[PDB]
């Protein structure tokens, strides 16, 4: 009923170019004219594309095949750890991100992703160490502050908001996601946030991507207030955008999976 | 509040396992032309069901090149032509379907829909009446016939819908939507019945996909573009890629966006 009043995108669809590329990849992979390094590479690329299309099992199959050809692929263990997190296997996810960082200690995203895994794994203090490390590599990225806030808020919400406020204040305030931060701080209404979101989006994909991020963070906000019905609706609304490779899409599905259990 | 939404449908592990296996079989020289054609068709159907309609059309076209007597393939190719807005070419594809196989009934539904979208409502009504006649208890056949008749004569279209409802067993869930069309119940009541009838996330998504399309068409026919647009997006958000209502919610949204 209320759903007709929401800010909504057309759920994202595969593009023709993406489909053309997958068709060509099938043909090249089928041919006998690739060296192992060229194969491992192409399998990784196809895996990234399939993940981006929401086909995470086909992505996993490709990543794993590439890894068996070329073991030195932090990029693959990264995806594998994300998928373990999405599956609720946090212990194994930690071991995957540990492998990422042993192969390549500069592969940053493993801190983000291991942090998220630790968060969902109930290890808030350790999550903060990884998410702080990630934040430090780019303090202007509002999503890094949002994740650090999430990891501090169960323990000390008051302090979490003080920290988030400090992060917002230090930042250049340029990237759109700081709006989500201002909503979390109580500076703006949800109406103001949604207005700002529609105003910023200029086509369907930018709209879908804002709604995927924003509805996930609104979902977590309501969830942490104990409003399960709003949280649920908001996670569903996030996923409806079909931004398959966003962290917020992944963990919106995860949060829905957790609400479905209880 | 959350119960009027489904979790958007996702590929299942089995669907992805089947695709991976299909790739390796197609890469082999183990297939006769007839086996290859069939496997290509099957992959195409799966691709289609996952929303990967260009990969599907690739498989379908290749299958047809190997085995030209495939009404099944022309039917999908017709559907894609309708989705793409190429209604004349769509009519020709469905013509080929029916010339290869006059009993390929769904071609009449699909050509009907294509004629509707192509603005040929009287021609669309011949195909949709014929499709109706083949299964009068299928509410969706009455809904599409109604949609086609209502632009020409709304009073008459309603009176035929009313007779179709009356004559039907009124069992299938789609008759609820017909009841809303007929003015018997409120939209809220429809959505309450939908929630009560769905059993799990996939049937909820499938109901929401159908229902939101027909609600969107109702609003669109009243000139309420905003409600329509929301409803069509809400239909698509279910990810029921292979439903008529999904395909044409997407088409309607492309027509609305073109404006």
* Chain A interface residues (partner B, CB cutoff 8 A): 1-6, 8-11, 13-14, 16, 19-20, 22-23, 26, 30, 53-58, 61, 204, 228-233, 236-237, 239-240, 242, 253, 256
Tokens of A91: 């212990």
**Is A16 close to B233, i.e. CB distance below 8 A?**
no
Q: Mention every residue, 6+ apart, whose C-beta is less than 8 A from residue B228.
A: B216, B217, B219, B220, B252, B256
Are residues A167 and A135 in contact, defined by beta-carbon separation less than 8 angstroms? yes
- Nearest CA-CA partner of A129 in A161, A163, A152: A152
Facing B230 at nearest CB: one of A8, A23, A56: A8
- Give the C-alpha separation, B108 to B114, whole Å: 10
Tokens of A178: 């700081």
Q: How many Cβ atoms sit within 10 Å of the Cβ of residue B79?
A: 25
* Resolved by: X-ray
For chain A, which domains are there?
A: 1-262 (1.25.40.10)
Facing B16 at nearest CB: one of A4, A58, A242: A58
Tokens of A32: 């006998």
Residues in A closer than 8 angstroms to B237, CB to CB, are: 8, 11, 240
Facing B1 at nearest CB: one of A9, A204, A230: A230
- Nearest CA-CA partner of B182 in B167, B206, B162, B210: B162
**Is A19 close to B253, i.e. CB distance below 8 A?**
no
Q: H helices within chain B, ranges in order?
A: 13-26, 33-49, 53-66, 71-83, 87-100, 106-117, 121-134, 139-152, 154-167, 174-181, 187-197, 201-221, 225-236, 244-258
B239: left (phi over 0), alpha (psi -120 to 50) or beta: left
End-to-end, the C-alpha distance of chain A in Å comes to 25
Dihedral angle sign, alpha carbons of residues A234, A240, A241, A246? positive
Q: How many Cβ atoms sit within 10 Å of the Cβ of residue B29?
A: 4
Facing A237 at nearest CB: one of B5, B27, B236: B5
Are residues B108 and B130 in contact, defined by beta-carbon separation less than 8 angstroms? yes
3-state secondary structure chain A: CHHHHCCCCCCCCCCHHHHHHHHHHHHHHHCCCCCHHHHHHHHHHHHHHHHHCCCHHHHHHHHHHHHHHCCCCHHHHHHHHHHHHHCCCHHHHHHHHHHHHHHCCCCCHHHHHHHHHHHHCCCHHHHHHHHHHHHHHCCCCHHHHHHHHHHHHCCCHHHHHHHHHHHHHHCCCCCCCHHHHHHHHCCCCHHHHHHHHHHHCCCHHHHHHHHHHHHHHHHHHHHHCCCHHHHHHHHHHHHCCCCCCCHHHHHHHHHHHHHHHC
Would you call B39 helix, strand, or coil by DSSP? Answer: helix
- CA of B116 vs chain A CAs: smallest distance (Å): 23
Are residues B74 and B41 in contact, defined by beta-carbon separation less than 8 angstroms? no
- Give the C-alpha separation, A139 to A46, whole Å: 32
Residues in A closer than 8 angstroms to B23, CB to CB, are: 26
Facing A256 at nearest CB: one of B7, B19, B231: B7
- CA of B127 vs chain A CAs: smallest distance (Å): 30
Are residues A204 and A10 in contact, defined by beta-carbon separation less than 8 angstroms? yes
Q: Mention every residue, 6+ apart, whose C-beta is less than 8 A from residue A261.
A: none
Place of tokens 């992505």: A59
**Is A233 close to B2, i.e. CB distance below 8 A?**
yes
Are residues A11 and A242 in contact, defined by beta-carbon separation less than 8 angstroms? yes
- Give the C-alpha separation, B252 to B206, whole Å: 18
- Nearest CA-CA partner of A187 in A209, A208, A164: A164
- Give the C-alpha separation, B172 to B143, whole Å: 13
Helices A228-239 and A247-261 pack at an angle, to 10 degrees, of 140
**Is A232 close to B2, i.e. CB distance below 8 A?**
yes
Residues in A closer than 8 angstroms to B13, CB to CB, are: 57
């Amino acid at each position: 009923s209320w759903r007709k009043s929401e800010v909504l995108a057309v759920p994202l669809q595969p593009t023709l170019q993406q489909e053309v590329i997958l068709a060509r990849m099938e043909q090249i992979l089928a041919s006998r004219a690739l060296t192992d390094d060229e194969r491992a590479q192409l399998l990784y690329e196809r895996g990234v594309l399939y993940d981006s299309l929401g086909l995470r099992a086909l992505a996993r199959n490709d990543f794993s095949q590439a890894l068996a050809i070329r073991p030195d692929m932090p990029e693959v263990f990264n995806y594998l750890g994300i998928y373990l997190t999405q599956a609720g296997n946090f212990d194994a996810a930690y071991e995957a991100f540990d492998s990422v960082l042993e192969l390549d200690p500069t592969y940053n995203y493993a801190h983000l992703n291991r942090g998220i895994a630790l968060y969902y794994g109930g290890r808030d203090k350790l999550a903060q160490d990884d998410l702080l490390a990630f934040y430090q590599d780019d303090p202007n990225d509002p999503f890094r502050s949002l994740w650090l806030y999430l990891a501090e808020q169960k323990l000390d919400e008051k302090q979490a908001k003080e920290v988030l406020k400090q992060h917002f204040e230090k930042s250049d305030k340029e990237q759109w996601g700081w709006n989500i931060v201002e909503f979390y701080l109580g500076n703006i209404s949800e109406q103001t946030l949604m207005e700002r979101l529609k105003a910023d989006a200029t086509d369907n994909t930018s709209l879908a991507e804002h709604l995927s991020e924003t509805n996930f963070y609104l979902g977590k906000y309501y969830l942490s207030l104990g409003d399960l019905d709003s949280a649920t609706a908001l996670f569903k609304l996030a996923v409806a955008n079909n931004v398959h490779n966003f962290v917020e899409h992944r963990y919106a599905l995860l949060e829905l999976s957790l609400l479905g259990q209880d």
